[PDB]
Design a protein around this nucleic acid. Structure first.
Lengths: 304, 248, 87, 302
RNA sequence: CUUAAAGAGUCAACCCUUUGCUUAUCUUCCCUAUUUAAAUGUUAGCAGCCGCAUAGGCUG
């Protein structure tokens, strides 16, 4: 009767970013780059914890990683690549019937908009996260298919119209809508000032020697591929009471803040996917949300 | 005669560094043999053996503890809980730079082989890790054991993996022989009955548990017999080197 | 009590070449190598190892070995040597 | 009933100093800067603890880091930059309602006084800590928005009125009370004398061959950005029985003296924050203190 | 046909005071550095004219 979902339905991710390496340059001398190295320092502080005042007179010594621009370079340079891949509907472990009728129900999905918002998050430098705070200007250089595009200061929380973002979203939507691949080589330049703190990815480790460990590749500050990924796929402006774009998540999850904007309101990925497969009609943006979840990849479990 | 194709400096970011429950780090030979077989399936080129070497490698985390990856919510019936950090299994990731060498059956011209190889690599991963950049693959050939040394040193520089077998067992050999365990194959524990939940509806399925050997890392140069460093599938659902156990 | 319990969800699945055919392998871990080998590497002062605690936060809900060996299990640090920067 | 604070309510720091580098110049030839390098020396001393006189005949060897001006330069030059960042009421991690009603409760905070006292701590040279002792004169240079300002003769422990401090604090308060950012670029020149001991930031290393270790960057003596910052936000003169300004900490903690001048008397940041969100009224100086804690940054949740 | 397929570690921070490394000192004996040699890369480039000149062409 009802076409139910497999026990596990799995898709691979289709936006594949690399690690972001962090160099230091001068804004008007971008061909003399030097790597930003992770260092270690002592940090003494107080016990300023909301709970207990009875131990605020004691201190706490700590040691942490830190990363800074040198005192003779004013510009942070962040480098990475992003590979977009097609065949966004070939399941990796899910069955045949459910996945194929879903591929059929979603072939009319607005891929131009998804490609635009991906490329736009890349070009405006949302992937730079806290490295955006306090920048004089941000300049993004994207090299794709022997073409070089330059982007100056761009509004991140609005997907404002730009002819070059659209010109790259052309090829990106062409690959996503069909098959093949396309690789963008991305550079970011931020004018922060000589000696400014940069913000590499923070490590999630049980390490008693450090209170804060920054991600490093042979000592050089870097950012996790998965964090750049979480930045790029932040395109969801379609949940109820929508304010700012959030990352494509099956439950609209922002565990960061302790809320999920798609929990228990008929608008989660599984409700909408069961709808799409079982004959129901989908909004253009519900189609976009479900297909963006497929682009995200995942191992969606539960069912029979 | 004997043709090889080499791809140097394969920068890979995001490797699934857990090869088994007791080995975390360099992806094992089973992984690179599976990569070679995937290429065989996807291009049609017959892949005799593969030899891989680490140029750079780092497991994420500290010296004695691997990094955690932040699990994102993924399963049905969890909406009443997606407002909190998802529970979390261990999944150590790593980042590295490798050099690969595939022995292939090729009769055509080198340009066609190189282009097919590149077009495959552009669609692949390595042990789950995203491939960020690789050099242009190039072909070499060997008749006698003299040109084999040139093919060998063409991979320079990198540390390739040789199989030095198991004397007592994994743990005693690690302590006494100062070597490193490595997943070399699998042991079948029980046949799986129903392919309702498998990658295939038809392929034979088994619950398995890894089988290991004791390996060593050596500069492709200092290796004398290059066959001792070329890994391929084979007997008893393991993998091994063309030149057997390493002692020249 | 030594009865089998088949379950493949969440577990990895690889193809493996069996005589120019393929078997699907679903790997599971061996209790001996972690209970015994952890104790052994501890006895013989082997330090080239990662410590990995299994069944986080609530171990006793996982396994008796996890429940009573809360310090963690030792894994062989399989990092390879690296080509030095200078060449 | 009560607006409970979200468990992960946190603000990011808004006064961002860099690490300070330490050079040596001559007072009347400031274009010839040479860097002060951290060295290592042996130090032999006595066992002179208050407790045991039985060890008073025993000695002790150590090795320590040390930092001196050369014997041909007489002036220490400390260099750093400080970036002030606005949106001081937009929370980093906390949700909406608690943070939004707190932002409404504090829109009448004296941003002029906050900016003035920050800029003044920078201009009077409090950020120099022990490098201020024994100076024939101190000359501070602050560059901002293509405008250069020089300061000599400023009392560190009093917020005396100064026209240049106020003119810089104007831009600083324009950023802190609105949006945007601004970078003050700071140099300090101290006439200490040739060969004078200088005081970089000290490190802690569990067990090392070194008993006392100094903060260096590529071997050059330096000061932690957090130490300069702690000097910058020493503006709190509003705790009970206040003598001198203390650094803005939610409990008014001064761990160096083992006391907390705002702990356990309904003057801590958490009591005042709860009151402000839950209807109760705050003094003008209490609004200043709470906004200064928001500019400090930190986690304000259970 | 890769232990395949999937994932944001994030806010904040004063490490501070003080110091004698002291005494003394034999590094000694012996020694064959040898044969031989194409720097090749023909060097590989440029000085003057006409020119609206980084269009093209021409002088021994």
């Amino acid at each position: 009767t009802k076409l139910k979902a497999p026990a596990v339905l799995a898709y691979s991710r289709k936006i594949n970013p690399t690690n972001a390496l962090m160099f230091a340059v001068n804004w008007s001398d971008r061909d003399n780059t030097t790597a930003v190295m992770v260092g270690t320092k002592t940090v003494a502080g107080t016990q300023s914890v909301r709970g207990n005042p009875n131990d605020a007179d004691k201190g706490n010594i700590q040691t942490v990683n830190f990363a800074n621009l040198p005192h003779n370079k004013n510009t942070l340079l962040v480098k990475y690549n992003v590979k977009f891949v097609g065949d966004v509907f070939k399941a990796e472990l899910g069955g045949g019937e459910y996945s194929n009728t879903l591929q059929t129900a979603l072939e009319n999905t607005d891929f131009g908009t998804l490609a635009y918002r991906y490329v736009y998050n890349i070009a405006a430098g949302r992937t730079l996260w806290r490295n955006r705070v306090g920048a004089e200007s941000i300049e993004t250089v994207i090299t794709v298919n022997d073409q070089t595009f330059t982007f100056s200061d761009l509004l991140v929380n609005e997907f404002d119209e730009d002819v070059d973002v659209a010109e790259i979203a052309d090829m990106v939507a062409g690959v996503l809508s069909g098959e093949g691949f396309v690789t963008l080589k991305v550079e970011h330049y931020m004018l922060l000032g000589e000696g400014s703190e940069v913000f590499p990815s923070q490590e999630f480790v049980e390490n008693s020697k450090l209170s804060k460990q920054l991600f490093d590749l042979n000592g050089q500050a870097a950012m996790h591929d998965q964090k750049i990924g979480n930045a790029i796929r932040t395109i969801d402006t379609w949940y109820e009471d929508a304010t700012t774009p959030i990352a494509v998540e099956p439950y609209g999850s922002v565990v960061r803040n302790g809320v999920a904007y798609r929990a228990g309101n008929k608008t989660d990925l599984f409700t909408l996917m069961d709808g799409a497969v079982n004959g129901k009609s989908l909004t253009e943006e519900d189609q976009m949300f479900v297909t963006a979840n497929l682009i995200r990849g995942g191992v969606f479990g539960g069912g029979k | 005669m004997r043709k090889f194709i080499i791809v140097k400096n394969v920068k890979v970011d995001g490797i699934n560094a857990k090869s088994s429950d007791i080995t975390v780090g360099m992806p094992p030979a089973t992984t690179f043999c599976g990569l070679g077989e995937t290429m065989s399936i996807k291009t049609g080129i017959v892949v005799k053996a593969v030899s891989y070497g680490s140029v750079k490698f780092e497991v994420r985390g500290s010296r004695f503890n691997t990094s955690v990856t932040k699990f994102a919510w993924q399963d049905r019936g969890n909406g009443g809980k997606a407002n909190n950090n998802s529970p979390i299994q261990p999944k150590p990731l790593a980042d590295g730079v490798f050099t690969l060498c595939f022995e292939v059956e090729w009769e055509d011209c080198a340009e066609v082989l190189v282009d097919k190889v590149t077009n495959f690599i552009n669609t692949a991963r390595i042990a789950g890790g995203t491939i960020a950049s690789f050099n242009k693959p190039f072909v070499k050939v060997a008749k006698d054991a003299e040109e084999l040394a040139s093919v060998k040193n063409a991979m320079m520089p990198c540390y390739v993996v040789v199989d030095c077998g198991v004397e007592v067992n994994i743990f005693e050999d690690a302590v006494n022989r100062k070597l490193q365990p490595m997943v070399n194959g699998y042991k079948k524990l029980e046949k799986i009955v129903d392919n309702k939940h498998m990658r295939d509806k038809f392929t034979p399925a088994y619950l398995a548990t890894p089988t290991y050997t004791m390996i060593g890392y050596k500069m492709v140069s200092n290796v004398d017999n290059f066959d001792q460093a070329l890994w391929q599938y084979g007997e008893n659902t393991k993998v091994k080197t063309i030149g057997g156990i390493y002692n020249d | 009590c030594c009865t089998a319990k088949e379950d493949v969800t969440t577990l990895p699945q690889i193809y493996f070449k069996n005589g120019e055919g393929y078997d699907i392998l679903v790997p599971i871990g061996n209790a001996h190598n972690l209970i015994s080998g952890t104790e052994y590497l501890w006895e013989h002062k082997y330090y080239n190892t990662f410590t990995q605690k299994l069944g986080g936060s609530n171990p006793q809900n996982c396994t008796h070995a996890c429940n009573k060996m809360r310090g963690g299990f030792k894994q062989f640090n399989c990092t390879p040597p690296q080509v030095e920067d200078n060449y």
